[PDB]
Each structure stands twice: as C-alpha cells, then as structure tokens.
C-alpha cells in the first residue's frame, strides 16, 4: 500500500473464478488500468471496451460485491470509463460481469464470475 | 458437436495458412467469438474490429469458401458483427481475408489466407 | 533493407526503455504496423487506439526524436493513423509518449520512454 501521490498505470489480468488461468472476460477491459493515489484511497479506473455487450460489473468492496461507477461513457465509440476501490492490490479481486450477445435471437443474455489479478503501479 | 442449447463464448486463434504459428490477421477479429446453439446449427459470430481496412472475409462451408454475413455494422466505431457456420470445431477453419491500407497512395490493397483454430465453448 | 515495392504488414513489440521486457504503452498502438516500400523510403503507419489519452508521440530520426505526422484522425472512434520513417528495422527504435489520464481530477498528465522492436515485413 506504500505508494506516493500521482498518476500511475497499473497492469492486470482476468483469471477464471476457480482456476489460475486467463478468463475470456479479459478482452472486455483495456489494459493497463489507471491508478490515482489521492488522500490514501486506491482508486482504479478502466475502459470497458464494449459498452453494448457488458451490461453490468460489480467489484468486491468491504467483503461484498458492489456495482462500479461510470466516469464517462462513449456511446459513439462503444466504450466507457469505470471507477472502483480495491482493498488490497495483492489479493485476487473477485468480480461478476453481466453480458449480452449481439445475435438477432430470443436468447442472448449471459453472466460470469472472474478475478482481477493486479501487478505493480508504474 | 454434443452441446446443449444456449449462448456460449467460444475462443479462437488465427494461425498462418501453412504454419502452426499465429497469423498477424488475428488482430482484426475480437476474441472470443459468440456461439448460438440453436436447432443443431453451429453459428459463430465475431466482431471485425476494423470495418474500413477489412473489406472482405470468406469461411469454408461444405468444402468451399463463401462470403460471411453481416449481423450489424457500426460505421461510427469502425466495427461490424459477422456470422458464419462451421462444419467441425476440431478442424482448422481455412479463411481468406481482403484488406486495404489506410495510406494516402496509389498502392494499398492486400489479401491473405489464414486458419481459425477454435477451442471449447463456455 | 532489401525489400521490393508494395504494401506489407510489419509486426512490432513495445519494450521498456532500459529493460528487454514488454512496455505497458504497447496497448496504445494497433498491431501490426503498415509498411509502404516506395522510392527506397521505409514508411511505417500505425493506429494510435486512444486519441484522447495519447497526446504526443516522437520517434528517432537521424539521431534525434521528432513528432510523428497524422495520416487521418477519427474523433468519433477515438483513433488516429500516424506516419514515421525508421533508419533500421533491426535496431530498437526509441520513442517517447505523452499521455493524459481520463480521471476527473487536478493531476492526470504522464509521459514514458519505450522502444519499438520490429519483426519482418509480410
């Protein structure tokens, strides 16, 4: 947690919920994540690269999963910037994502559980 | 082929035409591909992440290469969703792509052959 | 340097300034880069996939770093096509990038040094 004030680019990997392997959900988020070290608060910002498909995202805060906040949304470029706090950048951050298939059919909804594994701030 | 009804995310890799190595053409397609298991028909959908550059794409169906169908096109975000049927998700699916360089010159056209190698549905 | 006339797709990796490891800045540029072999001039074109964040980019030419030229800019899709000459496609091309965080705060600016390592034209 010992980090000085400023803007740093923090890398991440999305791993499967109960497997130490890469999750297919990783491709919905732009790497690296932005890190603002302000007033001793670890704020992580990341571009959700498919606004239409990814409908909801929740990240663990104080022991429970809470819906992420939208910094700014770009409906023309099909992207959005999301903001969330992390308790520890050393523990695999459990996250649940709700998605929608672009198919022209009755069934299209989906949802998956995955873990965000953060490297070191730069 | 033994798969139940529903929406599943199928991963893929683009390999070189006559080499078991990754093809540079992989970066024109968004991973993973969407899979709709409806009425015993293996339908694969994928985002072509550069609408202007990638001009044509054909995938092998019943022994011959046929031009892929457009689900929906996004001219503002420079993307499009394409749909194609696969005979077997265990054989390397041969595909031919036609592309155009964004350079301001007389010569800009190009075309390449590659293989889609599908993993398992999720 | 012995290459015939035409359009070829050249792959690249962004490595850390003083480390032979991948740079986080790699995700701001679309792979592969376009190569036009016209009148014995090695011209490299690449899509900067985040127009708003990446504010400036300079590539080494004749021993010094010079600001890259804009082929065409897409403000709707948040992209731009940049053009620059390379002295040798065998030496790690030193580059300096200026970036801006999308956070809603006083501090957001940043800048990093990295090297472009080019493979072979296709």
Domains of chain B: 1-122 (2.60.40.1850)
Strand arrangement, sheet containing A33-38: A6-10, A33-38, A41-48, A79-85, A69-74
Nearest-CA distance B43 → chain C (Å):
28
Neighbours of C104 (CB within 10 A): 12
Chain C, nearest residue to A45 by Cα: C103
HEC string for chain A: CCCCCEEEEECEEEEECCCCCECHHHHHECCCEEEEEECCEEEEEEEECCCCCEEEEEEEECCEEEECEEEEEECCCCEEEEEEECCCCCCCEEEEEEEECCCCCCCCEEEEEEEEEECCCC
Q: After which residues is chain B broken (C to N over 2.5 A)?
A: none
Q: Contact C17/C115 with Cβ under 8 angstroms?
A: yes
**Residue B24: its chain C contacts at CB < 8 A?**
9, 11, 31-32, 122
Instruction: Report the half-sphere exposure of C76 (CA within 13 A, side-chain side).
Output: 8
Q: What Cα–Cα distance (Å) separates residue C47 from each residue in A31, A121, B103, C25?
A: 17, 26, 11, 13
Return the residue of C nearest to A121 by Cα: C24
Task: Give the whole-angstrom CA distance, residue C47 versus residue C72.
Answer: 10
Compute the distance between CA of residue B101 and CA of residue A114 in angstroms, rounded to an integer: 38
Question: Which tokens in the block code for residue C11?
Answer: 């792959």
DSSP label of B111? E
Contact B71 A24 (CB under 8 A): no
Candidates C115, C94, C121; CA nearest to C22 is C115
As given in the structure block, the two tokens for residue A109 are 């909804």
Q: CA C99, CA C102: separation in Å to the nearest integer?
A: 10
Experimentally determined by:
X-ray
What's the farthest any 2 CA atoms get from each other in chain B?
51
Residues of B in contact with C32 (CB under 8 A): 24, 27
- Distance of alpha carbon C34 from alpha carbon B103, whole angstroms: 8
Chain C residues inside the 8 Å CB shell of A43: 103
To probe the interface with B, which of A74, A103, A104, A110 has the most B CB atoms within 10 Å?
A: A103
Do B18 and B65 touch, CB atoms closer than 8 A?
no
The Cα of C91 is separated from the nearest Cα of chain A by a number of Å equal to: 26
Task: Return the exposure string of B59-75: e unless at least 16 CB atoms fall within 10 Å of the residue's CB, then b.
Answer: bbeeeeeeebeebeebe
In the numeric block, the tokens 């699916």 are attached to B93
Searching chain A, which residue's CA lies closest to the CA of residue C25? A32
Alpha-carbon span A8 to A120, nearest angstrom: 9
Residues 6+ apart with CB under 8 A from A103: B7, B34, B36, B43, B45, B71
Beta carbons of A51 and A70 less than 8 angstroms apart: no
User: Cα B69 vs. chain centroid, distance in angstroms?
Assistant: 11
CA-based R_g, chain B, Å: 15
B78 vs C79: CB contact, 8 Å cut-off?
A: yes
Residues 6 or more apart in contact with residue C3 via CB below 8 angstroms? C37, C121
Helix, strand, or coil (residue B48): strand
- Taking alpha carbons only, the member of C94, C93, C88, C117 closest to residue C2 is C88
Show Cβ contacts of residue B88 under 8 Å, excluding neighbours closer than 6 positions: B1
Nearest-angstrom CA–CA distance, C16 and A63: 36
Nearest CA in chain C to A31: C27
Residue in A10, A36, A32, A12 with CA at minimum distance from that of residue A22: A12
| Residue B108: exposure state from Cβ atoms within 10 A (0-12, 13-18, ≥19) | middle
Q: How far apart, in Å, do the first and last CA atoms of chain B sit?
A: 14
> What are the DSSP E strand ranges found in C19-108?
33-38, 41-48, 54-61, 64-67, 69-74, 79-85, 93-100
Angle at C13 between CA C10 and CA C14, to 5 degrees: 130
Task: Judge residue B96's burial from the number of C-beta atoms within 10 Å of its C-beta, 0-12 exposed, 13-18 middle, 19 or more buried.
Answer: middle
Resolution in A: 2.7
Residue C99 CA from chain centroid, whole number: 14
Helices and strands, counts by H and E, chain C: 0, 10
Q: Does residue C10 contact residue C118 with C-beta atoms inside 8 Å?
A: yes
Residues 6+ apart with CB under 8 A from A31: A11, A12, C24, C27
> What tokens does C56 get?
């400036």
Which residues does residue C58 pair with via DSSP β-bridges, in sequence order? C67, C96
Cα–chain-centroid distance for residue A56?
11
């Amino acid at each position: 947690s010992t980090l000085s004030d400023g803007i740093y680019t923090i890398p991440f990997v999305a791993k499967k919920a109960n497997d130490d392997s890469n999750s297919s959900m990783q491709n919905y988020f732009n790497n690296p994540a932005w890190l603002k070290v302000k007033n001793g608060k670890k704020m992580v910002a990341m571009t959700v690269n498919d606004n239409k498909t990814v409908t909801a995202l929740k990240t663990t805060l104080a022991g429970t999963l809470q819906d992420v906040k939208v910094v700014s949304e770009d409906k023309d470029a099909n992207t959005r910037i999301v903001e969330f706090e992390v308790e520890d950048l050393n523990q695999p951050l459990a996250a649940h994502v709700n998605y929608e298939a672009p198919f022209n059919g009755s069934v299209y909804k989906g949802q998956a559980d995955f873990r965000y594994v953060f490297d070191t701030a730069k």
